[PDB]
């Protein structure tokens, strides 16, 4: 574990991360996608072999020794508000499983059904809020990767805010 496990947010490209694994904000079928899940398939394209993971699980997969964790959050033009936010939560105590048997001291993970997959909503509180729910038993040092400053500052005021 890390000695004083905490919470970070950096507001930068995922696959630059300097973390001991990343989550990748994938689709259920492996595909390269858009967005985070491209950036990902760039970086490490080795990962993508037998990714494919059904809405609300994650798969790891070794890019070398690099842990690629594949998580499959719900996207929210297919589902309800209330089928969705049970596979959202879902998606993320898979991560945090995987997180804890990988041993690894930390993570880089996105806000998981924020983006493509938010059915055209600010999804940053719910994701967020989900996210925290999971890691927060796990001692990895978690850095949340964000596209924008205006979340930038919203997620780094939620972190504070527990203190
Ligand atoms: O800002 C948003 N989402 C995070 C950034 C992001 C990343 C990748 N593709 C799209 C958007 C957002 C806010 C309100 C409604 C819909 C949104 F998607
Ligand atoms: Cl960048
Ligand atoms: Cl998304
Ligand atoms: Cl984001």
Same mark, same amino acid.
């Given at each position: 574990?890390?000695?004083?496990?905490?919470?970070?947010?950096?507001?930068?490209?995922?696959? =630059?991360?300097?973390? &001991?694994?990343?989550? $990748?904000? #994938?689709? *259920?079928? !492996?595909?390269?996608?858009?967005?985070? @899940?491209?950036?990902?398939? =760039?970086?490490?394209? &080795?990962?993508?072999? $037998?990714? #494919?993971? *059904?809405? !609300?699980?994650?798969?790891?997969?070794? @890019?070398?020794?690099?842990?690629?964790?594949?998580?499959?959050?719900?996207?929210?033009?297919?589902?309800?508000?209330?089928?969705?936010?049970?596979?959202?939560?879902?998606?993320?105590?898979?991560?945090?499983?995987?997180?804890?048997?990988?041993?690894?001291?930390?993570?880089?993970?996105?806000?998981?059904?924020?983006?493509?997959?938010?059915?055209?909503?600010?999804?940053?509180?719910?994701?967020?809020?989900?996210?925290?729910?999971?890691?927060?038993?796990?001692?990895?040092?978690?850095?949340?990767?964000?596209?924008?400053?205006?979340?930038?500052?919203?997620?780094?005021?939620?972190?504070?805010?527990?203190?």
């Amino acid at each position: 574990g890390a000695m004083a496990p905490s919470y970070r947010v950096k507001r930068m490209d995922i696959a =630059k991360n300097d973390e &001991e694994c990343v989550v $990748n904000a #994938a689709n *259920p079928r !492996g595909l390269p996608g858009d967005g985070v @899940c491209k950036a990902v398939y =760039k970086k490490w394209p &080795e990962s993508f072999k $037998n990714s #494919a993971t *059904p809405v !609300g699980t994650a798969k790891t997969v070794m @890019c070398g020794t690099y842990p690629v964790i594949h998580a499959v959050g719900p996207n929210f033009s297919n589902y309800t508000e209330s089928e969705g936010d049970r596979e959202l939560a879902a998606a993320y105590r898979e991560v945090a499983k995987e997180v804890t048997r990988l041993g690894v001291n930390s993570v880089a993970i996105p806000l998981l059904s924020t983006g493509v997959y938010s059915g055209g909503k600010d999804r940053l509180t719910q994701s967020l809020n989900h996210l925290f729910t999971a890691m927060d038993s796990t001692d990895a040092d978690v850095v949340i990767y964000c596209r924008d400053k205006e979340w930038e500052k919203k997620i780094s005021e939620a972190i504070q805010m527990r203190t």
